[PDB]
Amino acid sequence: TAIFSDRYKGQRVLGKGSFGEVILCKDKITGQECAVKVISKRQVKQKTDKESLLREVQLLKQLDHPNIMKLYEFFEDKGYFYLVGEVYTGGELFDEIISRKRFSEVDAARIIRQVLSGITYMHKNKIVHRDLKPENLLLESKSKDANIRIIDFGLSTHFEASKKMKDKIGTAYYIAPEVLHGTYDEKCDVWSTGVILYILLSGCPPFNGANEYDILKKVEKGKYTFELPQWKKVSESAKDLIRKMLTYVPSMRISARDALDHEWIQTYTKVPSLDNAILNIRQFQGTQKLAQAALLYMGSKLTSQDETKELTAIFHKMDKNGDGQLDRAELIEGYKELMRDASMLDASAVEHEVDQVLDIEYSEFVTVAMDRKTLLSRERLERAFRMFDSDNSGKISSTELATIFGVSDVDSETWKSVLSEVDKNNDGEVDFDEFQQMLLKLCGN
Numbered sequence: 001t002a003i004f005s006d007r008y009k010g011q012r013v014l015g016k017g018s019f020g021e022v023i024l025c026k027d028k029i030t031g032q033e034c035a036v037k038v039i040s041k042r043q044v045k046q047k048t049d050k051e052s053l054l055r056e057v058q059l060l061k062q063l064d065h066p067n068i069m070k071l072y073e074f075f076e077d078k079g080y081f082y083l084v085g086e087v088y089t090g091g092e093l094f095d096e097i098i099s100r101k102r103f104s105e106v107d108a109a110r111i112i113r114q115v116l117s118g119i120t121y122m123h124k125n126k127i128v129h130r131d132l133k134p135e136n137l138l139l140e141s142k143s144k145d146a147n148i149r150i151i152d153f154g155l156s157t158h159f160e161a162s163k164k165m166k167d168k169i170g171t172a173y174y175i176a177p178e179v180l181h182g183t184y185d186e187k188c189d190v191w192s193t194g195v196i197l198y199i200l201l202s203g204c205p206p207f208n209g210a211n212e213y214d215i216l217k218k219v220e221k222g223k224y225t226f227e228l229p230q231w232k233k234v235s236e237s238a239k240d241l242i243r244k245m246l247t248y249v250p251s252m253r254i255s256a257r258d259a260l261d262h263e264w265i266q267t268y269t270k271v272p273s274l275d276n277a278i279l280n281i282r283q284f285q286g287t288q289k290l291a292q293a294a295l296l297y298m299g300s301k302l303t304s305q306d307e308t309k310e311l312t313a314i315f316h317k318m319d320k321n322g323d324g325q326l327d328r329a330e331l332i333e334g335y336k337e338l339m340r341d342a343s344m345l346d347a348s349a350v351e352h353e354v355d356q357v358l359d360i361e362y363s364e365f366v367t368v369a370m371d372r373k374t375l376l377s378r379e380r381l382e383r384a385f386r387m388f389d390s391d392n393s394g395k396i397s398s399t400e401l402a403t404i405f406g407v408s409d410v411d412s413e414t415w416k417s418v419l420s421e422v423d424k425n426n427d428g429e430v431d432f433d434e435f436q437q438m439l440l441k442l443c444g445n
């Protein structure tokens with residue numbers, strides 16, 4: 001057996017994908033950078049045995065396609081799995097798209113030919129994604145004509161998805177109806193890609209609703225339209241491909257490979273800009289990211305409540321003196337003890353964090369060590385609020401809050417009630433401090 005931190009050290013956290021946090025790490029000998037997804041066993045159940053996971057891992061390491069994340073290594077210890085893959089710098093596809101003056105079917109066809117090409121390859125090797133969505137499409141580099149790299153292929157088969165809403169935002173729109181009901185195969189990826197295509201050419205989800213369950217209700221019924229005025233600008237062959245990919249019965253649904261041969265992919269890769277679709281995607285994306293940011297802020301405030309009190313009790317018990325003061329090594333031992341932590345991969349990781357907080361009285365260390373994380377979490381929320389507020393009015397209206405909280409799965413009576421307690425007179429709009437106050441009251445503060 002071989003240990004992960006013998007070989008890799010953490011550089012810095014990258015984000016929270018499905019199943020766990022992704023950490024930028026560096027090989028301590030060759031200096032190679034890698035994106036390590038760390039799966040916490042204690043919060044992510046397995047669907048399969050160890051025998052079956054080690055086999056898929058062995059296979060995934062051998063596979064190689066320019067539109068699929070390269071997986072280098074797999075580690076496991078008592079408490080976690082470590083998936084070590086190549087790191088990409090171009091960001092999520094949709095964030096790159098919203099920063100464009102123009103976007104035509106030629107851009108959409110090129111994007112989707114890549115996605116279908118990755119999928120086709122994977123299905124040939126009997127690997128299904130199931131959870132394909134825009135968050136899982138990364139651009140390989142910051143440069144112009146760069147490859148899309150699909151992440152997380154094969155994982156849904158071996159791990160149970162979170163049922164917490166901070167992990168579910170923007171999954172409902174893309175899931176294939178047959179996955180909802182239990183009997184599904186590789187055709188579910190074609191469906192998901194079909195929904196992405198739809199959104200690329202109109203900027204609106206084909207199945208949409210006020211909340212998660214309403215979205216799933218629309219998907220399960222399977223009915224959508226091309227009524228929206230901006231479809232008047234999309235070719236018929238594009239609509240024709242969408243129809244085949246969003247075909248309800250999976251055996252009647254076009255395959256990945258066959259979609260690559262479809263007339264639309266054939267024509268539009270080998271031309272007006274969809275101006276309306278871009279403005280729609282830009283609004284969609286801000287909305288999703290602000291809802292995500294809200295939920296993560298609420299979560300971090302609750303973790304902070306938890307971890308503040310726990311560290312205090314640890315440092316109290318450790319202070320044999322009653323001095324209200326601890327040594328450096330003891331602050332490290334009690335901080336290590338707090339971990340019983342994506343960044344804190346080893347004892348050396350923690351020492352840096354302890355030394356950052358210092359750069360005496362344990363009660364002060366506790367405030368700062370958390371207050372850092374508390375202020376750190378606020379700023380991500382602020383940025384998303386600014387981004388959402390695209391006309392720089394400084395406010396979010398009632399209608400917008402309803403869209404935002406609906407995506408966040410906060411009951412309408414519950415947030416409206418919270419709004420009233422924050423500002424009485426109110427005037428139907430909230431500024432940033434009001435928004436933040438509402439979220440504090442939505443996590444018992």
Ligand SMILES: Nc1nc2ccc(C(=O)c3ccccc3)cc2n1CC1CCNCC1
Pocket residue numbers: 014015016017022035036037069083084085086087088089091092138151152
């Ligand atoms: N920049 C970058 N390149 C990445 C490559 C892969 C991943 C993974 O989520 C991953 C890594 C290993 C195994 C399975 C998934 C994650 C990667 N990231 C960080 C993402 C980039 C998009 N925003 C959320 C964090």
